[PDB]
Structures are given as structure tokens and as C-alpha cells.
Design an enzyme around this catalytic site. Structure first.
Site, PDB file in Angstrom:
ATOM      1  N   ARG A 214       0.834  -1.201   0.000  1.00 51.05           N
ATOM      2  CA  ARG A 214       0.000   0.000   0.000  1.00 51.05           C
ATOM      3  C   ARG A 214       0.871   1.254   0.000  1.00 51.05           C
ATOM      4  O   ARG A 214       0.552   2.242  -0.665  1.00 51.05           O
ATOM      5  CB  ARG A 214      -0.947   0.013   1.202  1.00 51.05           C
ATOM      6  CG  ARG A 214      -1.703   1.329   1.385  1.00 51.05           C
ATOM      7  CD  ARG A 214      -2.553   1.683   0.172  1.00 51.05           C
ATOM      8  NE  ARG A 214      -3.066   3.051   0.254  1.00 51.05           N
ATOM      9  CZ  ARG A 214      -3.584   3.723  -0.768  1.00 51.05           C
ATOM     10  NH1 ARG A 214      -3.670   3.158  -1.967  1.00 51.05           N
ATOM     11  NH2 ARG A 214      -4.019   4.964  -0.594  1.00 51.05           N
ATOM     12  N   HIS A 241     -12.264   1.830   9.473  1.00 51.68           N
ATOM     13  CA  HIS A 241     -12.559   1.148   8.214  1.00 51.68           C
ATOM     14  C   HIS A 241     -11.263   0.786   7.501  1.00 51.68           C
ATOM     15  O   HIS A 241     -10.255   1.478   7.649  1.00 51.68           O
ATOM     16  CB  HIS A 241     -13.428   2.013   7.298  1.00 51.68           C
ATOM     17  CG  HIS A 241     -14.869   2.064   7.699  1.00 51.68           C
ATOM     18  ND1 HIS A 241     -15.831   2.685   6.930  1.00 51.68           N
ATOM     19  CD2 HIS A 241     -15.516   1.572   8.781  1.00 51.68           C
ATOM     20  CE1 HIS A 241     -17.006   2.574   7.523  1.00 51.68           C
ATOM     21  NE2 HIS A 241     -16.842   1.902   8.650  1.00 51.68           N
ATOM     22  N   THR A 339     -11.787  -4.958   2.356  1.00 50.06           N
ATOM     23  CA  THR A 339     -11.049  -4.948   3.609  1.00 50.06           C
ATOM     24  C   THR A 339     -10.008  -6.060   3.540  1.00 50.06           C
ATOM     25  O   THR A 339      -8.871  -5.906   3.984  1.00 50.06           O
ATOM     26  CB  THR A 339     -11.973  -5.166   4.823  1.00 50.06           C
ATOM     27  OG1 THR A 339     -13.009  -4.175   4.826  1.00 50.06           O
ATOM     28  CG2 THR A 339     -11.184  -5.083   6.122  1.00 50.06           C
ATOM     29  N   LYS A 439     -37.271  -5.619 -19.235  1.00 50.55           N
ATOM     30  CA  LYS A 439     -38.041  -4.847 -20.217  1.00 50.55           C
ATOM     31  C   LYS A 439     -39.379  -5.467 -20.635  1.00 50.55           C
ATOM     32  O   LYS A 439     -39.422  -6.581 -21.156  1.00 50.55           O
ATOM     33  CB  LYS A 439     -37.198  -4.595 -21.471  1.00 50.55           C
ATOM     34  CG  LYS A 439     -36.333  -5.763 -21.900  1.00 50.55           C
ATOM     35  CD  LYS A 439     -34.956  -5.676 -21.266  1.00 50.55           C
ATOM     36  CE  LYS A 439     -34.279  -4.359 -21.615  1.00 50.55           C
ATOM     37  NZ  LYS A 439     -32.957  -4.213 -20.945  1.00 50.55           N
ATOM     38  N   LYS A 525     -23.685  -8.903  -2.127  1.00 52.25           N
ATOM     39  CA  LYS A 525     -25.104  -8.863  -2.481  1.00 52.25           C
ATOM     40  C   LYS A 525     -25.605  -9.992  -3.382  1.00 52.25           C
ATOM     41  O   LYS A 525     -24.961 -11.029  -3.543  1.00 52.25           O
ATOM     42  CB  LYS A 525     -25.473  -7.515  -3.107  1.00 52.25           C
ATOM     43  CG  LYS A 525     -26.018  -6.509  -2.093  1.00 52.25           C
ATOM     44  CD  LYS A 525     -25.040  -5.430  -1.688  1.00 52.25           C
ATOM     45  CE  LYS A 525     -25.732  -4.446  -0.752  1.00 52.25           C
ATOM     46  NZ  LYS A 525     -24.898  -3.259  -0.430  1.00 52.25           N
TER      47      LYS A 525
END
Length: 540
Positions: A214, A241, A339, A439, A525
Site C-alpha cells: 500500500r 474502516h 477490507t 423490459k 449482495k
């Protein structure tokens, strides 16, 4: 080989040593330039210099060593964003003691779970976190000592950093002669908390090797911020975080002035951005929606503002463009990561901003997109499952081999669970879902909105909506529904409920199917394709 996308070489060759050694080197340099500001508290206006930060970090490092802390120990930091937050963090990194940033608004159960995983010997907390830390200490005997971050002298019978230092540091100690410890790069640097869909947060074990990579990105002129004197950044990312930790530590390496806020406030934010002449602003995802609505941005002088960056998940193209226009910018500086990957593994290259794109693969990393069915590796402009691989990938979940091996395969590929594609220029696009619209014959838009309608129903716990296609002409909106504990609904009741929420027969035209859990989280999700099969099978 082909379709594996690699980041380029770093701009600067890699530094040697641990994250503590590299951090110490830079801080010591900035410290000797008096007046160089490390952190600024926007609410009270107080500045702390690198000289102050460096000296405190060295004193804390040696003090913790003398106290008896070694590689096998951890400390925790539980506090609102503050000037003092990173002081014990820098010190711990100097001596190879693992740091566990702990959410200051955790409830009793969440707090116990977090500290139960990291098992800290010392907890550094703010006055505002002391009572909850005192409570958890009764349950976690490993916690031997509590130190107050934002007090000069002892507070409620607990030592301040100054008092702790006074007890365990000899008067012969010279901060500018202090030498950080050397140790194996796989030594734990941080234990970060991360929750998938599976109940409570896990511990993410980040190594010094993770962190120094990093450190390469953060000062990279293309994938980070070019180190330039008198650079200031306003950040409203929680320091506990993953991206809060990895961006903020990076800014210290860069010698930047980091303007912080205890809590977001529109006026104070914009006033600070203006008065501190910040070149960048780092925002959490949900604040982009906020500033898209803000009318106050124009009333402030932001002529020094060069970039607005997302310190979290990738953003929607339209929301990003709207915020860009608000701040008079060409685009948003974006990054995709977890994370579990320390920081962003895909980042908007400086001067190469594509709208909707989260950027390009960072140095040292690799990325691939796989066919949702075959697992086949895919070429450009083909949507599929995104995987990440590189030296910022965590050592693993703390004491949870099963969760680790479910996320990271035997060759080090992280299964992000996100859908994406890259273009011919190898810019990556994260797509939220897999499609996005079902649609009618002409048009109808019922993605997350129908799901939100369904979630508001008292008897409905969860819901996923997908389009069902068949030779029966067109595409019908359908949903799988998770009822609440011991409650009863019919397909009609769910359908009629939505029917009385939107127009145009765009209210479930296929059929509702009740299930024990919404298809897949897989740590993230909704699995849109899984939903499609379950509903299709139901139609007959």
C-alpha cells in the site's frame, strides 16, 4: 495467460523493511521540518505537527516495548476520528505489535465479538469510548491496561499517553535516536473487522507485507498521490474502516496535512475544504448521493480542489458525474477493493479517468473476469465474476480457516463476488447486479426499487428480484421472498402490495416464490442468475 490483467511496474522501486521501518523513515524526515502539519481537527481547529506525531510514536513504541509487548501481542484502538488516533498505531507498527482498530459505536455484543477476536493486551480509547471498553474488559481478561487517547493527564483513574510514557520510558530516551524493530514481513500489522452477509464481523489479518505494498501505491504518481509540499486532504472516512486505515496511513507516508472530522457536517466540511485549501477530499460512498443534492458547493471557493475520491465501494456512473459537476471536476477518483485486500486493487489512474470505470489494476496485482457458468476466463467487454490476486491480499481471517478458504483459492485468487468487465484499454467496470433492467415491450425499470418496496413490508424480511425470460414473450419481473419469523403471506398479497406501489403492470408479472434465504450473498449482495433459475423452474 490471456485475459489475466496485470498492473504495471511501480513508479518507484520498493523500499526495504517493515511497514514500521518505512513509516518511521518518512515521519522522521517530515518531523525535522518544523511547522509541517500531520493532522488537523476541523471541529476545534487544532493542528498537530509531524514533529509531535513522530516523537509521540517513538515514545509510545519504546514504552510498549518496556511494558513487555512483543510480536505475540496486540493493541486495540477504539475512538472517533481524532488527532491522536494514529499515534499508538504508528508506535505499534514500529515494534511489530498488531493493531486492531475497533468501531467506536459498536453495541455491547459487537464490541465483545471484535475484541474477542483481536485479543488486545492494551486498549487505547477516547474518553467517549472508555465506559464501553471498561465493560468489555470485565469479559475479556486479556485486556490488562486501558490508556486514554484524548487526555493530557490521567482520566477517571486511567493513564493518559503522557502518563503511560512517563512510567515506562527512561529520561535518557531520545526520539531521534530511536530505531524501529526489524521483523518478518508476514508479521501481523492490523486486524480489521469485516462483515459479509454471514452474521457477525470477522477479523481480517493484514501483514506488514500487505501494508508496505500500500505504501508503494500511495505515493505512486499514477495510482496514488504525487508527493508535493503543502498538500492537504480532507477525509471523512472512519479510521477503523479498511480504506480509512489504508488511505490515512498512506497520507502520513506522503507527508500530507490530513484534515479530519469527528462527524460529517455540510457547512463545516465545505468551509474547511475552502479555508485549508485542500487539494483532495475523500468521501464515503453514501456522501456522493448527498453532494449530488448539495446546493452550497458553489458558494465556497474551491479553486485549489483537484480531486474528489471515493474511500470505499465503486460508485454509480451518474452519481459520480453529478458530484464531479458540483465540484467543477472532470471526474471522480475511484478505487475498488475489499477490507480483505488491504486497500484498493483497482484505481483510477491519474489523468486517465473514464466515467463509470473504477480504474485499472494496481502495480503488483492481477485481475480476471470469469464466466458465471463455466468459470471460463473472459476477454474484454464481457461481464462476469471478478477475481483479485496480489501481495495486499490478507493472510486470512483470524482463527477462521473455513471462511478464508471459501474466499481465497489455493493460488491466492480472491473471489470478490462482484460482477465486472474490462474494456480494450483494460479499464474495469463494476456492475451492480448482472443486468439492471427487465423490459416490458418498450421499457420498465424495477431493479433495487421493487426490492426496497418489498423490504418495507412488515411480513417480509428479505427479497430478491430478477427478470424471468421464456418463449412466453418478453420479460416478466419476479421475486423470491423471505418471510419474517412465523408469518404467512400469499403470492397475491406480495404482488398486490407492490401493485399498489407502482404503475404500468411492472409489478411482478412472473410469480413470487417464498424461500428460506435470498439466493446468494457469498459475502456481498444478490446473485441475480440464481434467482432467475429458481423463478423460471417455478413457472410451468
Amino acid at each position: 495467460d490471456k485475459n489475466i490483467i496485470h498492473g504495471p511496474p511501480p513508479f518507484y522501486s520498493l523500499d526495504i523493511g517493515t511497514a514500521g521501518e518505512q513509516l518511521h523513515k518518512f515521519m522522521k524526515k517530515y518531523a525535522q521540518i518544523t511547522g509541517t502539519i500531520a493532522f488537523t481537527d476541523a471541529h476545534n481547529g487544532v493542528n498537530v505537527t509531524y514533529a509531535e506525531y513522530f516523537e509521540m510514536a517513538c515514545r509510545l513504541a519504546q514504552s510498549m516495548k518496556n511494558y513487555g509487548l512483543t510480536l505475540k501481542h496486540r493493541i486495540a484502538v477504539c475512538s472517533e476520528n481524532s488527532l491522536q488516533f494514529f499515534m499508538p498505531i504508528c508506535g505499534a507498527l514500529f515494534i511489530g505489535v498488531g493493531v486492531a482498530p475497533t468501531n467506536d459505536i459498536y453495541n455491547e455484543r459487537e464490541l465483545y465479538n471484535s475484541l474477542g477476536i483481536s485479543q488486545p493486551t492494551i486498549v487505547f480509547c477516547s474518553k467517549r469510548a472508555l465506559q464501553k471498553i471498561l465493560g468489555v474488559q470485565q469479559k475479556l481478561p486479556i485486556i490488562e491496561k486501558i490508556i486514554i487517547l484524548d487526555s493530557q493527564e490521567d482520566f477517571m483513574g486511567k493513564q493518559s499517553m503522557n502518563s503511560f510514557i512517563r512510567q515506562f520510558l527512561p529520561e535518557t530516551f531520545n526520539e531521534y535516536d530511536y530505531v524501529p524493530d526489524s521483523f518478518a514481513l508476514n508479521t501481523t500489522a492490523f486486524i480489521m473487522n469485516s462483515s459479509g452477509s454471514t452474521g457477525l464481523p470477522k477479523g481480517v489479518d493484514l501483514t506488514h507485507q500487505n501494508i508496505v505494498v500500500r505504501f508503494s501505491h500511495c505515493r505512486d504518481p499514477i495510482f496514488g498521490n504525487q508527493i508535493i509540499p503543502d498538500t492537504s486532504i480532507l477525509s471523512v472516512i472512519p479510521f477503523h474502516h479498511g480504506f480509512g486505515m489504508s488511505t490515512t496511513l498512506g497520507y502520513l507516508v506522503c507527508g500530507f496535512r490530513i484534515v479530519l472530522m469527528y462527524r460529517f457536517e455540510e457547512e463545516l466540511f465545505l468551509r474547511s475544504l475552502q479555508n485549508y485549501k485542500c487539494q483532495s477530499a475523500l468521501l464515503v460512498p453514501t456522501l456522493f448521493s448527498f453532494f449530488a443534492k448539495s446546493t452550497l458547493v458553489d458558494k465556497y471557493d474551491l479553486s485549489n480542489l483537484h480531486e474528489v475520491a471515493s474511500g470505499g465501494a465503486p460508485l454509480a456512473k451518474e452519481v459520480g458525474e453529478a458530484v464531479a459537476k458540483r465540484f467543477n471536476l472532470v471526474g471522480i477518483r475511484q478505487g475498488y477493493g475489499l477490507t480483505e485486500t488491504t486497500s484498493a486493487c483497482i484505481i483510477t489512474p491519474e489523468g486517465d479517468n473514464k466515467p463509470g470505470a473504477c480504474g485499472k489494476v494496481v502495480p503488483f496485482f492481477s485481475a480476471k473476469v470469469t464466466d458465471l457458468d463455466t468459470g471460463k476466463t473472459l476477454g474484454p467487454n464481457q461481464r462476469g465474476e471478478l477475481w483479485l490476486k496480489g501481495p495486499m491480499v490478507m493472510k486470512g481471517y483470524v482463527n477462521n480457516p473455513e471462511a478464508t478458504h471459501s474466499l481465497i483459492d489455493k493460488e491466492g485468487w480472491v473471489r470478490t463476488g462482484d460482477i465486472a468487465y474490462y474494456d480494450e484499454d483494460e479499464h474495469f467496470f463494476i456492475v451492480d447486479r448482472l443486468k439492471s433492467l427487465i423490459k416490458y415491450k418498450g421499457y420498465q425499470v424495477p431493479p433495487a426499487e421493487l426490492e426496497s418496496i418489498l423490504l418495507q413490508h412488515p411480513y417480509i424480511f428479505d427479497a430478491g428480484v430478477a427478470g424471468i425470460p421464456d418463449p412466453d414473450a418478453g420479460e416478466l419481473p419476479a421475486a423470491v421472498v423471505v418471510l419474517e419469523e412465523g408469518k404467512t403471506m400469499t403470492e397475491k398479497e406480495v404482488m398486490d402490495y407492490v401493485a399498489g406501489q407502482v404503475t404500468s403492470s411492472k409489478r411482478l408479472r412472473g410469480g413470487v416464490k417464498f424461500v428460506d434465504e435470498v439466493p446468494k450473498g457469498l459475502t456481498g449482495k444478490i446473485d441475480g442468475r440464481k434467482i432467475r433459475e429458481i423463478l423460471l423452474k417455478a413457472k410451468k
